[PDB]
Amino acid sequence: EFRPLTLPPKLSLSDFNEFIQDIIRIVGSENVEVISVDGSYMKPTHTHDPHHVMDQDYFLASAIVAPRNVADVQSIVGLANKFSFPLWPISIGRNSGYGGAAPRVSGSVVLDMGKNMNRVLEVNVEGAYCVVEPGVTYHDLHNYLEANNLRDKLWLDVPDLGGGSVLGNAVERGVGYTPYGDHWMMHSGMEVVLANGELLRTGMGALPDPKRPETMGLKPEDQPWSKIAHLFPYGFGPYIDGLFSQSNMGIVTKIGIWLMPNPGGYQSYLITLPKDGDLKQAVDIIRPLRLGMALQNVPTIRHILLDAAVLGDKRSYSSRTEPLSDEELDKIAKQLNLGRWNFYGALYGPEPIRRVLWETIKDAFSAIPGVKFYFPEDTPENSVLRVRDKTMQGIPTYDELKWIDWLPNGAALFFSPIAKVSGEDAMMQYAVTKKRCQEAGLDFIGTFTVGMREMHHIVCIVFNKKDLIQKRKVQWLMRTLIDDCAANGWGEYRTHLAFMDQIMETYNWNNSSFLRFNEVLKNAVDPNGIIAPGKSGVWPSQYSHVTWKL
Amino acid sequence: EFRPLTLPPKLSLSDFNEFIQDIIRIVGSENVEVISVDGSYMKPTHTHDPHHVMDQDYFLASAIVAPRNVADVQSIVGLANKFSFPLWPISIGRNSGYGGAAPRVSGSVVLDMGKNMNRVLEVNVEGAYCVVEPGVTYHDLHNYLEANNLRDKLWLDVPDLGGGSVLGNAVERGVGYTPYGDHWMMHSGMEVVLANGELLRTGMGALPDPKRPETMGLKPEDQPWSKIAHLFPYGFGPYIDGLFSQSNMGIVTKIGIWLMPNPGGYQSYLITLPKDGDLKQAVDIIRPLRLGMALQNVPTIRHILLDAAVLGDKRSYSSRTEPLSDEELDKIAKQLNLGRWNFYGALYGPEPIRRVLWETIKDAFSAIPGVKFYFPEDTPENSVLRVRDKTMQGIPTYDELKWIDWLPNGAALFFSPIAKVSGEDAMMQYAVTKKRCQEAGLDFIGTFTVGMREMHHIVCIVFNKKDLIQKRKVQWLMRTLIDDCAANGWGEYRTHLAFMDQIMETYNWNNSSFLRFNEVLKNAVDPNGIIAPGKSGVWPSQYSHVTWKL
Amino acid sequence: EFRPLTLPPKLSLSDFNEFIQDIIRIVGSENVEVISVDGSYMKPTHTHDPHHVMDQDYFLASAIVAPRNVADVQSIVGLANKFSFPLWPISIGRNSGYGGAAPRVSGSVVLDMGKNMNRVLEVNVEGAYCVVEPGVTYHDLHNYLEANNLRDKLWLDVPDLGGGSVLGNAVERGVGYTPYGDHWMMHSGMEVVLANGELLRTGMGALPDPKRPETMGLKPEDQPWSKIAHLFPYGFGPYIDGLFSQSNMGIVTKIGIWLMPNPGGYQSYLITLPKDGDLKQAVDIIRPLRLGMALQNVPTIRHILLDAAVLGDKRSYSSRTEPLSDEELDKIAKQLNLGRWNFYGALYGPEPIRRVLWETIKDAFSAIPGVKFYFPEDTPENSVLRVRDKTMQGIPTYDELKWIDWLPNGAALFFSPIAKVSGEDAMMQYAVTKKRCQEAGLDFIGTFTVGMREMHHIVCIVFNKKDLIQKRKVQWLMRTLIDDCAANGWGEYRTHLAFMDQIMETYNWNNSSFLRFNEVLKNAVDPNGIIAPGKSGVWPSQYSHVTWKL
Numbered sequence A, B, C: 001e002f003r004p005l006t007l008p009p010k011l012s013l014s015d016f017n018e019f020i021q022d023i024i025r026i027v028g029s030e031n032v033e034v035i036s037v038d039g040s041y042m043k044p045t046h047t048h049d050p051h052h053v054m055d056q057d058y059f060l061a062s063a064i065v066a067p068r069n070v071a072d073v074q075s076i077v078g079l080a081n082k083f084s085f086p087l088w089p090i091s092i093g094r095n096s097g098y099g100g101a102a103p104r105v106s107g108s109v110v111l112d113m114g115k116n117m118n119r120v121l122e123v124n125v126e127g128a129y130c131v132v133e134p135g136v137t138y139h140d141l142h143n144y145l146e147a148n149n150l151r152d153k154l155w156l157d158v159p160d161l162g163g164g165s166v167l168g169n170a171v172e173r174g175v176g177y178t179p180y181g182d183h184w185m186m187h188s189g190m191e192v193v194l195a196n197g198e199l200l201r202t203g204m205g206a207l208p209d210p211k212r213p214e215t216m217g218l219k220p221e222d223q224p225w226s227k228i229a230h231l232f233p234y235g236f237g238p239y240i241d242g243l244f245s246q247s248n249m250g251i252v253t254k255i256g257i258w259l260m261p262n263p264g265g266y267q268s269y270l271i272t273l274p275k276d277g278d279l280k281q282a283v284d285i286i287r288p289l290r291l292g293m294a295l296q297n298v299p300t301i302r303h304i305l306l307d308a309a310v311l312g313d314k315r316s317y318s319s320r321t322e323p324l325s326d327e328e329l330d331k332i333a334k335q336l337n338l339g340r341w342n343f344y345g346a347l348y349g350p351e352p353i354r355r356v357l358w359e360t361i362k363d364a365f366s367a368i369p370g371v372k373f374y375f376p377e378d379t380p381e382n383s384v385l386r387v388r389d390k391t392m393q394g395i396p397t398y399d400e401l402k403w404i405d406w407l408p409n410g411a412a413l414f415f416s417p418i419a420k421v422s423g424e425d426a427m428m429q430y431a432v433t434k435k436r437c438q439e440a441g442l443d444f445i446g447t448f449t450v451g452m453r454e455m456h457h458i459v460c461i462v463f464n465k466k467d468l469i470q471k472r473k474v475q476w477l478m479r480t481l482i483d484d485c486a487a488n489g490w491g492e493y494r495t496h497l498a499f500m501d502q503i504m505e506t507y508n509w510n511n512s513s514f515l516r517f518n519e520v521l522k523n524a525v526d527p528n529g530i531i532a533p534g535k536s537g538v539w540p541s542q543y544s545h546v547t548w549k550l
């Protein structure tokens, strides 16, 4: 195809056409798409940001290319290196709130790994691990377990929605809600295509499977792994895996992800905290419990509007364009039988062990007046608890997508700082965030997800994507939260394409020593700068900081 | 000081002398040492390998330099870069069985970070972490906790001996025996001096602590960390921490290590397995128990000779120069009230939870005929269980050093492959290893340490370091084990200076893609190749592979 | 001389010694100084910052070198380039409050141009200009005019103290108080030694004086200038002069500065403004008057404590360690017969024109209740008006040095933002600055100097240089003021060595385009980076930003 809306830097129309004809020859006209529609969560867009905070076509692919297999990715990298054409690899492209599948550099080729590199490569029972390609969503892996009846031996660990890619999410250091919720830490053994196009496998994945007649003559990509590849992540020498998470250091083609054995017992629960201020003592109560494993999974502390927005848009609770008052938030909480903060958790394993932990939890939470305790059965059919009850056992749902519809043409942008696990720090972060949302004309919507010694604070900014003024207030809000949080010693763990530079600039101890070190690494492994330039604020030397940073 | 036995590559005597005078002016004559004695575990040698498998002076420093602080390390790096002088950083230098403090390249300056960079920088109760410099041995950190009474709030995680550096051990991906036994995974926030001499801090350590009057004007090295630095390891962007473990990518000056809260209950235990063949069923029993967390810590399966060697040298059990027969191992086991394999573990937490897990463990292990169960009280005063009862609660001991004295001038060399957690794989690795020890004229001595989905098989080769013929059989044994194990699909997780190249060559999937990628990274960050060239087989471009590899 | 406390980067002791011997052979032992005392304003120190906000030896020369002439500077530049030794040129080195004579990079050679390159090269009556070398202080040029009776034809333009170098001050874009107060704009024709060591002359100074018998054979440095050299600054082509002010682009050896003809009438005056709040209306009154030239010179609006501090230390007005209250400032104002703000100006020219402008000024200022008007005769012997009456006619005094002694071991640090000439903007800047001084435990001391469309706000931070806690509060105050002011859209016009990087980082529109452009220029003209690296935040490529910025 002939003429794209945006060409990547320094490339001529003729070169773009020579390039696209070269790729069409490799992958088939059916797998290549030239951009000369926001779509849905259902069938994600792969050209731009469906939840566009900047203009809709601000972050835009010149073309979307779907490799059929690893050999196609090596060839496409060969061609991107020959023509100096930047690639933007995606797995599923549902990074909603983080830019969807849009490239950081406009004119890049969006590399859709997901459409054809789809396979559940292995489900190993005794080692309790799975091996997956980029296109395996959580829903897909769930169906795979069900079809082979593996559900009674191994459980999954899923984020709030089930359509994300198991690999994509793990390489972004995404989070789920069972004891295996730290997705990046459950990995072991990854396959990567380097920027130079060579194949690399990490850890014990570098220890080759001994030759045998049955595997002779296989392409590298298609060779099995040695026995400890997906069991012990470290291998020998430098542990380079982390270089591939949240980076532009390579294209991840395969990954092993450890899976939890059916625990032989499960019980989810909801603890309702009546006051807005009860966040402080709840978190102080969580702290010791999380550290000594009374709290096994990743429990979450949801703000009343996150549950309300799952249940119905803002127009169903008030016909007010401005942010709900404190008094209106108490009314909504009362109407839903929830508190101002709602703590969701789960117990795993034998009844005798659950019983004792549940008594410990109940007892500690009782120091907060008005606390109420519920199991799924005790709540209404449409309750969030009934949805999260599936979530904390590794079953994928899509119910939580509905809070994005809080406003008319609801688009989401996530502000994701980390807080200490202490009531004091949590209140401070909340107060700082709440204040700026108010100044911006937006309701505060958020969840705290409880890690062992930290909490990920997912502030959910929802705005109408067809309101120019509010889009501008959101950009102002985001950039100010970034700065206020940094001035309070909190950094974000993950962000959207437009804020990558400003968030990396916040990690500037000792005159930006961390970004300089990362640049050095990137320019050595990618001398033509073709793999996702700018991802995480890391720019290869051919991209002037002046021209490209935001 | 004037004339060293061995100069580093390409450096003249005149330049060595200029360099040393330059360093003496920086650190003081008392902190520099020119080598113009194997010592002890008590006062480790810092010039060569005390457990020398090669000739005693084969791996030798030209000089030993002790920086007083981080400014001194930056200045030494600056001088090493000016003169192209290789540095071999050590923390404590007790890497016995792995080369002690010896440099991979002879003529290097051994950088003793531990002598003056000694401080326990912070013990944070609420965040349950500690922050340490290279000189903090486990014993040191234990005494710090005792002195401030922290013992009742926070426990340590220690390897078999207490003299190791908490940081040194973790950057080697060392292993301890409590639930926080995976030392490298308990870290969060490191400070590194790069090869260019710049200071870097990883993760959230890159998000600076907000200015305040009290900390103004501090040198970078001396600035505090922001709140989440030692609570959430990831930070933002590429997670580069693993680039600094088992590597020559930089000189670690500080690290935070997460510490376990007193569990509120503890009970250690020993399960004796009568037959040599009971390893298979034991491991199959361990498998599910480890995966479902009935086994909380890192339990170990010790071979009867490892416990015997702790209790007395070989001469005290037989006056035979050849390896003990099977029948003699049964007699020794009987004499000590141990099995042929001895399973050591521990239970943590409230009595009601310990009770239930202990009944589950006992029950599962009962399927093996002749199994006996003991608590420390049930065994003799000198028992290994009583020593490990301290070990599995994070209390440092030195009792286990005695197995090194199995033979007259006993030296240790560790062969450390990983095995699946399956009886079949374990028996096979053991059989392979046992056969070669026998061909070599050595007793098989080893432990299996149980990770979640893998076991670390520490084969403890002990040899007389004044026996030339046996030293040679030891090198033959090691090199053959390496190849045999790789041919059965097992790689080693850590090794000694003399086998680093042969073990990295084993991790050659896709034509050594892993090592090539590592070399690219090393040459970019260390253009003069001054930081520990050859560490893990990774050689900077100025070190010919032909000249330097073993 | 053998061993300096601090060596410049990458240079050995041997090279330092070769270098120094080379310079001693060029300039004489009497003109070189090796540093192996804060001194006074009387005999300034040339080794470090006498008003040290950082540690006293934080910014320190390795040696001080005094060239006898321009040939010596070219030879020193040649040697600095051969050895890669950084030079820190000073003229007089009285940059008190801005770092004194201290180099930005410690270990630099401080190039004392003033000691021997001292000459008033020319005073031209018809062209009303003077030509000076670095060593000509204002006092010196005043005495030259007096000695030749030029006082009745030409006046000087002096800053608050008379000891500064006429050239040094102008290349820093310093400010004086007569109609020729914009010192950098009164220059025309400069001589510079470039970093490559070549001699350049700017503007019409590049159009050579036509040969004549009398000037044949002169060294370039010693040749006269052509007729328009000091009359028309521009010359032909690119006007590169500004590249040499506040820069490290070269070493200024000569400059011409335009001088005002005796105006044929002069009258200074003081307008006292009773209330703290009267700043707003005063500035709005100033605005139109400045723009239409009723206000001829650079009038100043001094804060009551600046005049009080000239008259006596803080101990003489209160024995309070904390900052004076509002009520105490009113008492002090009353005691001195001053307002809370005191406007100092002057009228120039014939009586009939002065009369009319004075009636216009008086009238406009009468809209502020309680305003009082004074001529020098009307005030006491020790009054500031009597001192500034000399200052606004270009006569040098040293009376104003006394406010530095406000506190026991008083040191000064200047915070120098620019403000619009509007009451609203002035009040806002003052409020911002006042609040932070208070949080820091310091009295607010400052002056506003009135440019045509801008005001220079000289906030005079005075602190005890032997108080560690206060030195730290001072650094906290400065760094916070910088950020607060930038967030309100004000940047500083000049600063101290320790804040140069943070102030240049503030001038980051379009991703720091201004600094990148400056770095490109610096690295082209100074490939060895020897001329004052880091001056104004501008670092040559051999100085890592990570290592060197503050």
Ligand SMILES: Cc1cc2nc3c(=O)[nH]c(=O)nc-3n(C[C@H](O)[C@H](O)[C@H](O)COP(=O)(O)OP(=O)(O)OC[C@H]3O[C@@H](n4cnc5c(N)ncnc54)[C@H](O)[C@@H]3O)c2cc1C
Binding pocket: A089, A090, A091, A092, A093, A094, A095, A096, A097, A100, A101, A113, A134, A158, A159, A160, A161, A163, A164, A165, A166, A167, A168, A169, A171, A172, A173, A174, A175, A176, A250, A251, A252, A253, A400, A401, A404, A412, A535
């Ligand atoms: C309502 C809602 C709820 C959410 N809840 C959660 C939650 O609970 N937990 C959570 O973690 N996230 C959550 N998210 C964030 C995001 O939606 C999910 O994390 C999702 O799984 C990410 O999209 P994707 O995995 O389909 O991947 P992709 O868009 O494919 O994103 C992968 C990204 O990682 C890189 N990448 C992906 N594949 C590759 C590859 N093969 N090679 C190299 N780089 C690659 C690229 O940077 C890319 O942009 C939520 C989002 C929404 C809208």
Ligand SMILES: Cc1cc2nc3c(=O)[nH]c(=O)nc-3n(C[C@H](O)[C@H](O)[C@H](O)COP(=O)(O)OP(=O)(O)OC[C@H]3O[C@@H](n4cnc5c(N)ncnc54)[C@H](O)[C@@H]3O)c2cc1C
Binding pocket: B089, B090, B091, B092, B093, B094, B095, B096, B097, B100, B101, B113, B134, B159, B160, B161, B163, B164, B165, B166, B167, B168, B169, B171, B172, B173, B174, B175, B176, B250, B251, B252, B253, B400, B401, B404, B412, B535
């Ligand atoms: C009887 C015996 C039992 C043992 N049991 C165990 C056990 O149970 N578990 C276990 O893990 N180990 C064990 N060890 C192995 C080893 O002795 C210990 O791990 C010990 O803690 C390592 O030495 P050190 O920590 O003093 O470190 P060092 O010798 O200081 O070694 C650190 C090594 O890591 C690197 N390094 C160290 N400090 C730095 C730094 N600051 N910057 C960059 N690189 C650095 C270098 O490569 C160096 O050689 C045992 C050894 C013996 C002899």
Ligand SMILES: Cc1cc2nc3c(=O)[nH]c(=O)nc-3n(C[C@H](O)[C@H](O)[C@H](O)COP(=O)(O)OP(=O)(O)OC[C@H]3O[C@@H](n4cnc5c(N)ncnc54)[C@H](O)[C@@H]3O)c2cc1C
Binding pocket: C089, C090, C091, C092, C093, C094, C095, C096, C097, C100, C101, C113, C134, C159, C160, C161, C163, C164, C165, C166, C167, C168, C169, C171, C172, C173, C174, C175, C176, C250, C251, C252, C253, C400, C401, C404, C412, C535
């Ligand atoms: C009480 C007090 C009051 C002050 N009042 C005023 C005031 O009213 N107005 C004002 O402008 N300043 C004022 N100053 C600031 C400063 O003290 C004066 O500006 C003083 O004239 C500067 O020092 P110097 O001229 O002796 O120069 P130097 O210290 O010699 O400084 C010149 C600086 O410019 C550069 N430089 C100097 N000479 C050369 C050269 N030959 N080549 C290249 N670069 C060169 C260097 O960066 C150097 O650090 C005041 C200071 C104090 C302590």
